[PDB]
Amino acid sequence: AVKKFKPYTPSRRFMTVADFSEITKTEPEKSLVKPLKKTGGRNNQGRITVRFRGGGHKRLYRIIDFKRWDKVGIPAKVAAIEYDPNRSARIALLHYVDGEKRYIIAPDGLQVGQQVVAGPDAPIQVGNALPLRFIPVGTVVHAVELEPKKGAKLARAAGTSAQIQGREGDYVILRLPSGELRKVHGECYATVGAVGNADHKNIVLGKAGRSRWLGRRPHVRGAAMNPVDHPHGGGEGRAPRGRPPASPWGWQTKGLKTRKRRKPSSRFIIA
Amino acid sequence: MKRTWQPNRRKRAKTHGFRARMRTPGGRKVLKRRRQKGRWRLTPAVR
RNA sequence: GUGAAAUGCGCAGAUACCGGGAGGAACGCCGAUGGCGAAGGCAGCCACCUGGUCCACCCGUGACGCUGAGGCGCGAAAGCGUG
RNA sequence: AGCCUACGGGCAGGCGCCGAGGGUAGGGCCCGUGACUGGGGCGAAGUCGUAACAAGGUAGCUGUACCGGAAGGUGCGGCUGGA
RNA sequence: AGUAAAAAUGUA
RNA sequence: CGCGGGGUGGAGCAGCCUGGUAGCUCGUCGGGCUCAUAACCCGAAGGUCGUCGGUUCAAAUCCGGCCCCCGCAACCA
RNA sequence: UGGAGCCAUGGGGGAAUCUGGGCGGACCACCGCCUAAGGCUAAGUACUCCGGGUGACCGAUAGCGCACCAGUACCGUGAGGG
RNA sequence: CUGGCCAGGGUGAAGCUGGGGUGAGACCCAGUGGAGGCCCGAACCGGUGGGGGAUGCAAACCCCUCGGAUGAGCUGGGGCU
RNA sequence: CUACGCAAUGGUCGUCAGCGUAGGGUUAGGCGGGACCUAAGGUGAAGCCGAAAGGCGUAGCCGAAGGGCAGCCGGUUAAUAUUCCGGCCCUUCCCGCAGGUGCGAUGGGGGGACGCUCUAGGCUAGGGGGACCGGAGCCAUGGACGAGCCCGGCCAGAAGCGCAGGGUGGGAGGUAGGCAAAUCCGCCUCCCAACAAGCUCUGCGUGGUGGGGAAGCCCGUACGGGUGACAACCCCCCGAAGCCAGGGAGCCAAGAAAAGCCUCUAAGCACAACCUGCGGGAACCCGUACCGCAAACCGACACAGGUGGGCGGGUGCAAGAGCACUCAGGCGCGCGGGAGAACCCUCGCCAAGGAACUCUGCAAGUUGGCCCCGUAACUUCGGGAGAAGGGGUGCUCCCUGGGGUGAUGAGCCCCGGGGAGCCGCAGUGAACAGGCUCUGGCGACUGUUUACCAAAAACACAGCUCUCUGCGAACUCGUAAGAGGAGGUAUAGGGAGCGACGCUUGCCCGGUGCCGGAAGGUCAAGGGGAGGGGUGCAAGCCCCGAACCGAAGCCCCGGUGAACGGCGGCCGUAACUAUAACGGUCCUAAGGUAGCGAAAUUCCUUGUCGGGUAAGUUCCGACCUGCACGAAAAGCGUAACGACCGGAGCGCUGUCUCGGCGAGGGACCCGGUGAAAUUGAACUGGCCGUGAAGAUGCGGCCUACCCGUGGCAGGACGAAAAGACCCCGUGGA
RNA sequence: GGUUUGGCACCUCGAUGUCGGCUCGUCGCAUCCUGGGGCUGAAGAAGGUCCCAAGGGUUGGGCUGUUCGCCCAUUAAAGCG
Ligand SMILES: [Mg+2]
Ligand SMILES: [Mg+2]
Ligand SMILES: [Mg+2]
Ligand SMILES: [Mg+2]
Ligand SMILES: [Mg+2]
Ligand SMILES: [Mg+2]
Ligand SMILES: [Mg+2]
Ligand SMILES: [Mg+2]
Ligand SMILES: [Mg+2]
Ligand SMILES: [Mg+2]
Ligand SMILES: [Mg+2]
Ligand SMILES: [Mg+2]
Ligand SMILES: [Mg+2]
Ligand SMILES: [Mg+2]
Ligand SMILES: [Mg+2]
Ligand SMILES: [Mg+2]
Ligand SMILES: [Mg+2]
Ligand SMILES: [Mg+2]
Ligand SMILES: [Mg+2]
Ligand SMILES: [Mg+2]
Ligand SMILES: [Mg+2]
Ligand SMILES: [Mg+2]
Ligand SMILES: [Mg+2]
Ligand SMILES: [Mg+2]
Ligand SMILES: [Mg+2]
Ligand SMILES: [Mg+2]
Ligand SMILES: [Mg+2]
Ligand SMILES: [Mg+2]
Ligand SMILES: [Mg+2]
Ligand SMILES: [Mg+2]
Ligand SMILES: [Mg+2]
Ligand SMILES: [Mg+2]
Ligand SMILES: [Mg+2]
Ligand SMILES: [Mg+2]
Ligand SMILES: [Mg+2]
Ligand SMILES: [Mg+2]
Ligand SMILES: [Mg+2]
Ligand SMILES: [Mg+2]
Ligand SMILES: [Mg+2]
Ligand SMILES: [Mg+2]
Ligand SMILES: [Mg+2]
Ligand SMILES: [Mg+2]
Ligand SMILES: [Mg+2]
Ligand SMILES: [Mg+2]
Ligand SMILES: [Mg+2]
Ligand SMILES: [Mg+2]
Ligand SMILES: [Mg+2]
Ligand SMILES: [Mg+2]
Ligand SMILES: [Mg+2]
Ligand SMILES: [Mg+2]
Ligand SMILES: [Mg+2]
Ligand SMILES: [Mg+2]
Ligand SMILES: [Mg+2]
Ligand SMILES: [Mg+2]
Ligand SMILES: [Mg+2]
Ligand SMILES: [Mg+2]
Ligand SMILES: [Mg+2]
Ligand SMILES: [Mg+2]
Ligand SMILES: [Mg+2]
Ligand SMILES: [Mg+2]
Ligand SMILES: [Mg+2]
Ligand SMILES: [Mg+2]
Ligand SMILES: [Mg+2]
Ligand SMILES: [Mg+2]
Ligand SMILES: [Mg+2]
Ligand SMILES: [Mg+2]
Ligand SMILES: [Mg+2]
Ligand SMILES: [Mg+2]
Ligand SMILES: [Mg+2]
Ligand SMILES: [Mg+2]
Ligand SMILES: [Mg+2]
Ligand SMILES: [Mg+2]
Ligand SMILES: [Mg+2]
Ligand SMILES: [Mg+2]
Ligand SMILES: [Mg+2]
Ligand SMILES: [Mg+2]
Ligand SMILES: [Mg+2]
Ligand SMILES: [Mg+2]
Ligand SMILES: [Mg+2]
Ligand SMILES: [Mg+2]
Ligand SMILES: [Mg+2]
Ligand SMILES: [Mg+2]
Ligand SMILES: [Mg+2]
Ligand SMILES: [Mg+2]
Ligand SMILES: [Mg+2]
Ligand SMILES: [Mg+2]
Ligand SMILES: [Mg+2]
Ligand SMILES: [Mg+2]
Ligand SMILES: [Mg+2]
Ligand SMILES: [Mg+2]
Ligand SMILES: [Mg+2]
Ligand SMILES: [Mg+2]
Ligand SMILES: [Mg+2]
Ligand SMILES: [Mg+2]
Ligand SMILES: [Mg+2]
Ligand SMILES: [Mg+2]
Ligand SMILES: [Mg+2]
Ligand SMILES: [Mg+2]
Ligand SMILES: [Mg+2]
Ligand SMILES: [Mg+2]
Ligand SMILES: [Mg+2]
Ligand SMILES: [Mg+2]
Ligand SMILES: [Mg+2]
Ligand SMILES: [Mg+2]
Ligand SMILES: [Mg+2]
Ligand SMILES: [Mg+2]
Ligand SMILES: [Mg+2]
Ligand SMILES: [Mg+2]
Ligand SMILES: [Mg+2]
Ligand SMILES: [Mg+2]
Ligand SMILES: [Mg+2]
Ligand SMILES: [Mg+2]
Ligand SMILES: [Mg+2]
Ligand SMILES: [Mg+2]
Ligand SMILES: [Mg+2]
Ligand SMILES: [Mg+2]
Ligand SMILES: [Mg+2]
Ligand SMILES: [Mg+2]
Ligand SMILES: [Mg+2]
Ligand SMILES: [Mg+2]
Ligand SMILES: [Mg+2]
Ligand SMILES: [Mg+2]
Ligand SMILES: [Mg+2]
Ligand SMILES: [Mg+2]
Ligand SMILES: [Mg+2]
Ligand SMILES: [Mg+2]
Ligand SMILES: [Mg+2]
Ligand SMILES: [Mg+2]
Ligand SMILES: [Mg+2]
Ligand SMILES: [Mg+2]
Ligand SMILES: [Mg+2]
Ligand SMILES: [Mg+2]
Ligand SMILES: [Mg+2]
Ligand SMILES: [Mg+2]
Ligand SMILES: [Mg+2]
Ligand SMILES: [Mg+2]
Ligand SMILES: [Mg+2]
Ligand SMILES: [Mg+2]
Ligand SMILES: [Mg+2]
Ligand SMILES: [Mg+2]
Ligand SMILES: [Mg+2]
Ligand SMILES: [Mg+2]
Ligand SMILES: [Mg+2]
Ligand SMILES: [Mg+2]
Ligand SMILES: [Mg+2]
Ligand SMILES: [Mg+2]
Ligand SMILES: [Mg+2]
Ligand SMILES: [Mg+2]
Ligand SMILES: [Mg+2]
Ligand SMILES: [Mg+2]
Ligand SMILES: [Mg+2]
Ligand SMILES: [Mg+2]
Ligand SMILES: [Mg+2]
Ligand SMILES: [Mg+2]
Ligand SMILES: [Mg+2]
Ligand SMILES: [Mg+2]
Ligand SMILES: [Mg+2]
Ligand SMILES: [Mg+2]
Ligand SMILES: [Mg+2]
Ligand SMILES: [Mg+2]
Ligand SMILES: [Mg+2]
Ligand SMILES: [Mg+2]
Ligand SMILES: [Mg+2]
Ligand SMILES: [Mg+2]
Ligand SMILES: [Mg+2]
Ligand SMILES: [Mg+2]
Ligand SMILES: [Mg+2]
């Protein structure tokens, strides 16, 4: 719903926070699955490779199940839904009957108690994972594999989701969150429903910290630096680029396409 | 004001230590260079 | 395409025809000097939820009525905010 | 610390409350005035078009929105006070 | 098979 | 003032480079249409090519001299 | 880059066993040299930490940085300077 | 990566609770509550204006003054470029 | 630490010392490290990569103020002590005995285990009183033999007890999971039990008992020793930020790991073995002096600087780690002694005036705490607010209301309320302790920055838009392997500009960029070889070489502005004049819209009017002929915020008219110690003149006894720095 | 004449600090006052103009960094170098 605050301090007049109603009945992670020290650090061996990262609240990684074919036919009651500092989404802790339990990117609609499962069979209803092919051409689904037995990799950000457009061979056509039309395999699992917490896109950070709390350092504009730093740099008295919108490395940043030309992944796309 | 030198034994040994000098070929040369020269301490003395 | 034209579209294969798919909006005939609602206004079909309205029986209450400054709700279209 | 006494006491006198009024500060209501600017009223002489009244030569009018030297044009819906 | 082009302005 | 662009019928532009030919639009004058005036139609007239000199057989045209119009520039102290 | 062979080889193609195969400065024909795609081999040659011998070499601001308890004192985080 | 520190005041958000309100509401009052790159101001961090200092106490200092002071805060130790 | 010492070191002195010579001095199963654990990271079997050198890298290994682990109170030394000693209390290993039990991991599970802010109830630390307890003593100087003054009224302590809390359901079935191997976890099912109890675990109180135990007086160099009493060792009150601790509540940014430690079982092995007792043995290595906000550390120095954690008492002030004084404890800053100049520094006051000072109220003053009334425009309804502007404030006595502790009564604390009355110039009587308001500009705001001349209108910022990226993502680093991105997946990640919020953001794809275009044009290697050449008697062996087929790119076609960017000229025309709504014409890709406008932009320029002043190149309001605004290098606004830059008032002032006096530190004199830049040599005057054009040094003339000391700053083209400007160099970056 | 703007480039680039103000002055006379004086289109008062003459005087504010100006209120005058 997004909570709002009276303006009793600027930087909090617009600030808004997500309505943590859904999570409820569990805030402290599952000391069993999750208990994974997440490694923080904004670069590789030595040098920083992604500018402006670092700082920002401590964080424990909740290990989740991105491939459901593990326990086919084995059902599981959705025990709870919790907060996961590692994604836009929320996650549902579910207890499989095997006794074993794991985490799943909590879809919009999921209710605690509501039992669910995955398999070729499985009732076509939110929370159940089935090979794309065994799914009603139309129904919306999220957490989609891209290649059989390779794990879920599509539509996992709060409220994202893909829709089945149709079939064609061993493949099925998906309209991905971005809007591109791709031909995913049939054997590619995918759990029915949309990602949920769709309210996410609506939070207003508010201050400059908060942006810090999320580990995102300040971003200094090219034209502010000098010739040596960025190409937009230099210029006595603020100026305007000098043509034509480029990045610190040299490439243009307005328009110029990037994806590998002759990539074999093409010819499976159309948008 | 705080000056450039802020003594710290662990640091000193770990940085210019005999062991350290031996790991890198560049360091090995330093050692060689010194011995060749006739220094009394190949490495910074520090107990 | 018009009064006639021109812009524009098409020999990179348009217009015209057939097959396939996507998507959005609107619901032809029925349809009317018709119906419903307090007003604005309401049209494919199905279901669920629901308001008002009319007829017959004279069964019940027993003047419990009418209007209504203010208040309150509704209120075409265009317009504004967020997605 | 005086003055009369009939020594209880009264008087003068001193202190304080309130207090006209003066002073400081901050407000409220009304009036005059002000470089410049916004429309409005009437104009016996000007400039530009011609919007509306006869399909007024694109029915008109209208709430709204946008745009235009101006009247006004066009969009969405509405009215007949048009056919 | 009768919806259908343009053509302003002017009183001594 | 220093490099550079320009003055051609009444207005606004060609023509100059590739010297011997002054073109275009509006306006002005004559006649129509109209009751009338615009518009519309038909027909005409109108230019020292800034100025003084030079080259040449001939100069708006090419060469220097001034007259003005417009545009850059006039920086380090 | 030249008329550019010879010797080596990253890439592609890809033989022959003496009627075999390379070379003699493109390339041909002559004439002639030599036997690739396995390996080894003293001596004559280089240098001077070390020992000795000399010197129209220095003689303590010279001569090695050091004639002396010097790569020390001292300086530098350090390499290093000295 | 792991530890530590932030005197004492001030203001008084959302929530709760109770009353009012309506058909149910929105909402409105109190009391509670203790939010915030909130306020004042030490430590701690900083370095605004002025003066002094200028072979200095000091190769950046001293005094007065001033800014932040629960945060994008300050800080020790162990690390990496 | 001690004994001898004083050359040098010490800014003087020096018998002293951190100095010289010598001798001592550092004692641990429990404190801290290691024979424990893991973090970032390092290393690194395997494995990948790399011209060599090397670079990655799973497990493992290293890596600690983090986790884990058993010592408290006293006493002694010249110098060490949780280390030696005394009392009290623990910990492991090993062997033995006894009694228990399926014992047993490098494996399984649990646990260890975690944020921020706010917090409850108890405790202790610490502190304050006491008429009570113990104790030498003391009546001074006018008064007091006094409930007088003065000093001390604690520490540790096993079991056992009490008091606070912390943890925790007990059963019995199944069981497809915990890379099943489990009686353990985990899941389903159901007799039971409960906002518990029971069982455990800390803290605190108590505890056999063991220590400690002043003031003053006597000895006394030193340091300390009897004294001291058989000392007392009790009662209330205040009370943590610490403990009980893994307590509670709220919140979003969602808060290490591993071992120890429980338990489950596998091999194994049960004459094992582990478990609880109880005896007796065993228990290593390293550190321990001393300095430690500093004279012992970093700053060449005994340097006014820098340096992390804990304790840090009392009274008063609303609070407090603030301010004043002061305990304990530590110091008086390792040159002194006199003077009583100018001048400098720091500091106090000042007649009348009160910003006239000046670039500028720069500096300084004013104001200041708290309680109480009382407060404007504007506003995003939070704020503006401490707006402003006022009143109160000490002490005395009387009356009176709550709360905490008790016990509902009492003292003891904690907040109040109303009366009278007292003295000063003055009551936050000293110290800490805002001056205010009006109006502009820029930026929204807290924040960041040029360590050492710039703190800002600059960067950042939430937020807006464009663009890329479908995941072995784009992108970044790397030769690569690999890594970041991300153990993320378009509500996400990269790049770019703008920069809260409000109203908005026009027109121009000609040129440039990017995006789309299976056509054409052009296009390399290569394919193809018409045709030609060199040689051979030749078969041949060699060379060139036209057609034509041949990518990307460019061309061409089209799109695109919150992509780079651009967004006109000349004439004419309306009742006086003006001006031009209107028109003509040339050019363009299209000719700048709204809104602003002598502005952080306006040259002319102090434009022209208004306002404000006695007077206003600034400031504010207007007008627009805008040299040279203008919409995301955003346009115009905006409450709040600002050590930002401007203009005004009020307040108050030594800024000033205009200076005066006073204080302290220097300066000055004496004793001690004793530098520096600079320096061709000097026996170094003025004026006119001359000279390389500004002379103590030449000419003429003038003046002038030799030498100092305190002062001033005109000259010695005074010092300093082989001029940053300028030019030159076929100089550099 | 040597106070402006310049011209030339002679000393100085192993450095001659380069506007304005303040403090402190000092000199020139081509005199702004004040003292003498000649003409006058000098009635008087007041001026104009030239001559002699620096001895001493030559104000305080607004604006601007300003010099300079302009302005306010004065003055015997508000001199120039
Ligand atoms: Mg690494
Ligand atoms: Mg930025
Ligand atoms: Mg810059
Ligand atoms: Mg760089
Ligand atoms: Mg560029
Ligand atoms: Mg560049
Ligand atoms: Mg500029
Ligand atoms: Mg640039
Ligand atoms: Mg140093
Ligand atoms: Mg260390
Ligand atoms: Mg040796
Ligand atoms: Mg076809
Ligand atoms: Mg019905
Ligand atoms: Mg009845
Ligand atoms: Mg609508
Ligand atoms: Mg709009
Ligand atoms: Mg809308
Ligand atoms: Mg929309
Ligand atoms: Mg009164
Ligand atoms: Mg008025
Ligand atoms: Mg009017
Ligand atoms: Mg007229
Ligand atoms: Mg009309
Ligand atoms: Mg009409
Ligand atoms: Mg309309
Ligand atoms: Mg239109
Ligand atoms: Mg209509
Ligand atoms: Mg007319
Ligand atoms: Mg008429
Ligand atoms: Mg002409
Ligand atoms: Mg005519
Ligand atoms: Mg006509
Ligand atoms: Mg230049
Ligand atoms: Mg080869
Ligand atoms: Mg080959
Ligand atoms: Mg053979
Ligand atoms: Mg060969
Ligand atoms: Mg050959
Ligand atoms: Mg040969
Ligand atoms: Mg040959
Ligand atoms: Mg040969
Ligand atoms: Mg051989
Ligand atoms: Mg061989
Ligand atoms: Mg050999
Ligand atoms: Mg030899
Ligand atoms: Mg020598
Ligand atoms: Mg000698
Ligand atoms: Mg030698
Ligand atoms: Mg030597
Ligand atoms: Mg050193
Ligand atoms: Mg050293
Ligand atoms: Mg409340
Ligand atoms: Mg704050
Ligand atoms: Mg503060
Ligand atoms: Mg303050
Ligand atoms: Mg502290
Ligand atoms: Mg800083
Ligand atoms: Mg400081
Ligand atoms: Mg300062
Ligand atoms: Mg500064
Ligand atoms: Mg200073
Ligand atoms: Mg100074
Ligand atoms: Mg402060
Ligand atoms: Mg740190
Ligand atoms: Mg370190
Ligand atoms: Mg002695
Ligand atoms: Mg001495
Ligand atoms: Mg000694
Ligand atoms: Mg270890
Ligand atoms: Mg380990
Ligand atoms: Mg590790
Ligand atoms: Mg390695
Ligand atoms: Mg440790
Ligand atoms: Mg520890
Ligand atoms: Mg000691
Ligand atoms: Mg002991
Ligand atoms: Mg067992
Ligand atoms: Mg675990
Ligand atoms: Mg006591
Ligand atoms: Mg007496
Ligand atoms: Mg006790
Ligand atoms: Mg507490
Ligand atoms: Mg381990
Ligand atoms: Mg051992
Ligand atoms: Mg010690
Ligand atoms: Mg200090
Ligand atoms: Mg400390
Ligand atoms: Mg000293
Ligand atoms: Mg010091
Ligand atoms: Mg510091
Ligand atoms: Mg400190
Ligand atoms: Mg106190
Ligand atoms: Mg106080
Ligand atoms: Mg203090
Ligand atoms: Mg003392
Ligand atoms: Mg005074
Ligand atoms: Mg006075
Ligand atoms: Mg005054
Ligand atoms: Mg002034
Ligand atoms: Mg002045
Ligand atoms: Mg000041
Ligand atoms: Mg304010
Ligand atoms: Mg204000
Ligand atoms: Mg008193
Ligand atoms: Mg108590
Ligand atoms: Mg105070
Ligand atoms: Mg204050
Ligand atoms: Mg303005
Ligand atoms: Mg301004
Ligand atoms: Mg700012
Ligand atoms: Mg700086
Ligand atoms: Mg600042
Ligand atoms: Mg915005
Ligand atoms: Mg490569
Ligand atoms: Mg990852
Ligand atoms: Mg981004
Ligand atoms: Mg993005
Ligand atoms: Mg900007
Ligand atoms: Mg336009
Ligand atoms: Mg364009
Ligand atoms: Mg284009
Ligand atoms: Mg185009
Ligand atoms: Mg293209
Ligand atoms: Mg070819
Ligand atoms: Mg041939
Ligand atoms: Mg091509
Ligand atoms: Mg005319
Ligand atoms: Mg006229
Ligand atoms: Mg413009
Ligand atoms: Mg405009
Ligand atoms: Mg002005
Ligand atoms: Mg401008
Ligand atoms: Mg101007
Ligand atoms: Mg100007
Ligand atoms: Mg005025
Ligand atoms: Mg003023
Ligand atoms: Mg004015
Ligand atoms: Mg002023
Ligand atoms: Mg203005
Ligand atoms: Mg601009
Ligand atoms: Mg735009
Ligand atoms: Mg722009
Ligand atoms: Mg802006
Ligand atoms: Mg503005
Ligand atoms: Mg500020
Ligand atoms: Mg700030
Ligand atoms: Mg201001
Ligand atoms: Mg004195
Ligand atoms: Mg002396
Ligand atoms: Mg001379
Ligand atoms: Mg001589
Ligand atoms: Mg002379
Ligand atoms: Mg002297
Ligand atoms: Mg002096
Ligand atoms: Mg001088
Ligand atoms: Mg000099
Ligand atoms: Mg030079
Ligand atoms: Mg420089
Ligand atoms: Mg001169
Ligand atoms: Mg001159
Ligand atoms: Mg010269
Ligand atoms: Mg010459
Ligand atoms: Mg020079
Ligand atoms: Mg010199
Ligand atoms: Mg003078
Ligand atoms: Mg004279
Ligand atoms: Mg007279």
Author numbering:
A (entry chain AD): 2 to 272
B (entry chain A7): 1 to 47
From the paper:
After the controlled degradation of RelB by Lon protease, RelE is able to bind the ribosome and specifically cleave messenger RNA (mRNA) in the A site (Christensen and Gerdes, 2003; Christensen et al., 2001; Galvani et al., 2001; Li et al., 2009; Pedersen et al., 2003). E. coli RelE is an 11.2 kDa protein consisting of a compact, four-stranded antiparallel β sheet flanked by three α helices. RelE occupies the A site and causes cleavage of mRNA after the second nucleotide of the codon by reorienting and activating the mRNA for 2′-OH-induced hydrolysis.
In the structure determined using RelEwt and unmodified mRNA, cleavage has occurred prior to crystallization, and there is weak but consistent density for just positions 1 and 2 of the A site codon, thus representing a postcleavage state. RelE occupies the A site in near identical conformations in both the pre- and postcleavage structures and blocks access of translation factors and tRNA to the ribosome. In addition, and unlike other structurally related nucleases such as RNase T1, RelE does not appear to catalyze the subsequent hydrolysis of the cyclic phosphate to 3′-phosphate.
